[PDB]
Design an enzyme around this catalytic site. Structure first.
Site, PDB file in Angstrom:
ATOM      1  N   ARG A 140       0.764  -1.050  -0.004  1.00 29.88           N
ATOM      2  CA  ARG A 140       0.094  -0.059   0.080  1.00 29.88           C
ATOM      3  C   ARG A 140       0.869   1.263   0.304  1.00 29.88           C
ATOM      4  O   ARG A 140       1.769   1.409   0.897  1.00 29.88           O
ATOM      5  CB  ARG A 140      -1.089  -0.055   1.228  1.00 29.88           C
ATOM      6  CG  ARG A 140      -1.987   1.007   1.031  1.00 29.88           C
ATOM      7  CD  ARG A 140      -3.056   0.822   2.341  1.00 29.88           C
ATOM      8  NE  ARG A 140      -4.221   1.623   2.061  1.00 29.88           N
ATOM      9  CZ  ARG A 140      -4.763   2.392   2.942  1.00 29.88           C
ATOM     10  NH1 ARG A 140      -4.162   3.014   3.652  1.00 29.88           N
ATOM     11  NH2 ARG A 140      -5.835   3.333   2.707  1.00 29.88           N
ATOM     12  N   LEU A 146      -2.475  10.464  13.861  1.00 31.27           N
ATOM     13  CA  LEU A 146      -2.119   9.180  14.318  1.00 31.27           C
ATOM     14  C   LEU A 146      -1.622   9.149  15.574  1.00 31.27           C
ATOM     15  O   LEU A 146      -1.231   7.881  16.146  1.00 31.27           O
ATOM     16  CB  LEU A 146      -0.938   8.716  13.142  1.00 31.27           C
ATOM     17  CG  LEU A 146      -1.738   8.309  11.916  1.00 31.27           C
ATOM     18  CD1 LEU A 146      -0.598   7.665  10.965  1.00 31.27           C
ATOM     19  CD2 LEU A 146      -3.065   7.482  11.753  1.00 31.27           C
ATOM     20  N   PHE A 185       4.623   1.444   8.696  1.00 32.89           N
ATOM     21  CA  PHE A 185       4.433   2.430   7.681  1.00 32.89           C
ATOM     22  C   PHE A 185       5.668   3.545   7.720  1.00 32.89           C
ATOM     23  O   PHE A 185       6.022   4.002   8.954  1.00 32.89           O
ATOM     24  CB  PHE A 185       3.120   2.941   7.392  1.00 32.89           C
ATOM     25  CG  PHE A 185       2.748   3.787   8.603  1.00 32.89           C
ATOM     26  CD1 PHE A 185       1.615   3.026   9.325  1.00 32.89           C
ATOM     27  CD2 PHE A 185       2.721   5.205   8.559  1.00 32.89           C
ATOM     28  CE1 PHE A 185       1.348   3.612  10.636  1.00 32.89           C
ATOM     29  CE2 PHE A 185       1.968   5.744   9.896  1.00 32.89           C
ATOM     30  CZ  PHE A 185       1.420   5.051  10.688  1.00 32.89           C
ATOM     31  N   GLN A 239       3.311   1.553   2.997  1.00 32.86           N
ATOM     32  CA  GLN A 239       2.907   0.477   4.168  1.00 32.86           C
ATOM     33  C   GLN A 239       3.423  -0.937   3.642  1.00 32.86           C
ATOM     34  O   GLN A 239       3.380  -1.084   2.614  1.00 32.86           O
ATOM     35  CB  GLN A 239       1.625   0.396   4.364  1.00 32.86           C
ATOM     36  CG  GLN A 239       1.107  -0.858   5.493  1.00 32.86           C
ATOM     37  CD  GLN A 239      -0.219  -0.540   5.747  1.00 32.86           C
ATOM     38  OE1 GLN A 239      -1.004   0.357   5.667  1.00 32.86           O
ATOM     39  NE2 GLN A 239      -0.608  -1.685   6.601  1.00 32.86           N
ATOM     40  N   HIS A 242      -0.713   5.025  16.913  1.00 30.11           N
ATOM     41  CA  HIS A 242       0.182   4.176  16.382  1.00 30.11           C
ATOM     42  C   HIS A 242       1.396   4.540  17.056  1.00 30.11           C
ATOM     43  O   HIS A 242       2.022   5.760  17.124  1.00 30.11           O
ATOM     44  CB  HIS A 242       0.266   4.561  14.974  1.00 30.11           C
ATOM     45  CG  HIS A 242      -0.860   4.258  14.263  1.00 30.11           C
ATOM     46  ND1 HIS A 242      -1.279   2.801  13.696  1.00 30.11           N
ATOM     47  CD2 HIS A 242      -2.254   4.960  14.010  1.00 30.11           C
ATOM     48  CE1 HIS A 242      -2.150   2.733  13.123  1.00 30.11           C
ATOM     49  NE2 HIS A 242      -2.911   3.892  13.293  1.00 30.11           N
ATOM     50  N   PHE A 246       1.198  10.669   1.556  1.00 31.08           N
ATOM     51  CA  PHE A 246       0.548  10.098   2.900  1.00 31.08           C
ATOM     52  C   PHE A 246       1.775   9.209   3.612  1.00 31.08           C
ATOM     53  O   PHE A 246       2.359   9.507   4.330  1.00 31.08           O
ATOM     54  CB  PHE A 246      -0.571   9.437   2.849  1.00 31.08           C
ATOM     55  CG  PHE A 246      -1.411   8.835   3.859  1.00 31.08           C
ATOM     56  CD1 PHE A 246      -0.930   9.373   5.426  1.00 31.08           C
ATOM     57  CD2 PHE A 246      -2.269   8.010   3.966  1.00 31.08           C
ATOM     58  CE1 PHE A 246      -1.362   8.711   6.335  1.00 31.08           C
ATOM     59  CE2 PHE A 246      -2.756   7.412   5.046  1.00 31.08           C
ATOM     60  CZ  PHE A 246      -2.380   7.881   6.209  1.00 31.08           C
ATOM     61  N   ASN A 255      -1.644  -0.858  12.882  1.00 30.66           N
ATOM     62  CA  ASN A 255      -2.295  -2.098  13.683  1.00 30.66           C
ATOM     63  C   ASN A 255      -3.848  -1.944  13.219  1.00 30.66           C
ATOM     64  O   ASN A 255      -4.081  -1.388  12.370  1.00 30.66           O
ATOM     65  CB  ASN A 255      -2.000  -1.392  15.353  1.00 30.66           C
ATOM     66  CG  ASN A 255      -2.596  -0.293  15.456  1.00 30.66           C
ATOM     67  OD1 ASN A 255      -3.969   0.035  15.220  1.00 30.66           O
ATOM     68  ND2 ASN A 255      -1.963   0.648  15.861  1.00 30.66           N
TER      69      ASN A 255
END
Length: 163
Positions: free
Chosen positions: A54, A121, A112, A62, A125, A59, A101
């Site tokens: 991903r 986040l 990521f 991942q 995270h 952004f 997660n």
């Protein structure tokens, strides 16, 4: 001092370049050790050969799902999942390395690399490292992402280990 680990990235099997990460073992030792050991493969499994499944430009990138290659798998060196260690460190901008997660205390192997500040986040995270060398290679990887995260070429960790 804090360990440094490298990923050698390939695009459809062609070498792209090397990224190195500093792991903040001084602040999140259990989370850092999981990523370190998965990068050396010393437990018998880990990241070598796995893909970035991903990638959303602007952004994050991942990866870390070395068992199902699509975001539904992976496991830690401590078992299927482990707890959120702490949230001392924040998502301050590009280059931050943070755990993916699926809810509280569900860390596995997926992670990521942020390519932007992702402050929403924070506290959800666990941040555990940063890119030290090769942020330009992360920027190059980003160009193979898309808005929905699907990559236009296969982005793999061709080799990895500890420097």
């Amino acid at each position: 001092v804090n360990p440094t680990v490298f990923f050698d990235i390939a695009v459809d099997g062609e070498p792209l370049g090397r990224v190195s990460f500093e792991l903040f073992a001084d602040k999140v030792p259990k989370t850092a050790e999981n990523f370190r050991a998965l990068s050396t493969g010393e437990k018998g499994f880990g990241y070598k050969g796995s893909c970035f499944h991903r990638i959303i430009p602007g952004f994050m990138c991942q990866g870390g799902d070395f068992t199902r290659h699509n975001g539904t798998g992976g496991k830690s060196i401590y078992g299927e999942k482990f707890e959120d260690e702490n949230f001392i460190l924040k998502h301050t901008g590009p280059g931050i390395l943070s755990m993916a997660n699926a809810g509280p205390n569900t860390n596995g192997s997926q992670f990521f690399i942020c390519t932007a500040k992702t402050e929403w986040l924070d506290g959800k995270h666990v941040v555990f490292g940063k890119v030290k060398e090769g942020m330009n290679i992360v920027e190059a990887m980003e160009r193979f992402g898309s808005r929905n995260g699907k990559t236009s070429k296969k982005i793999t960790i061709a080799d990895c280990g500890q420097l």
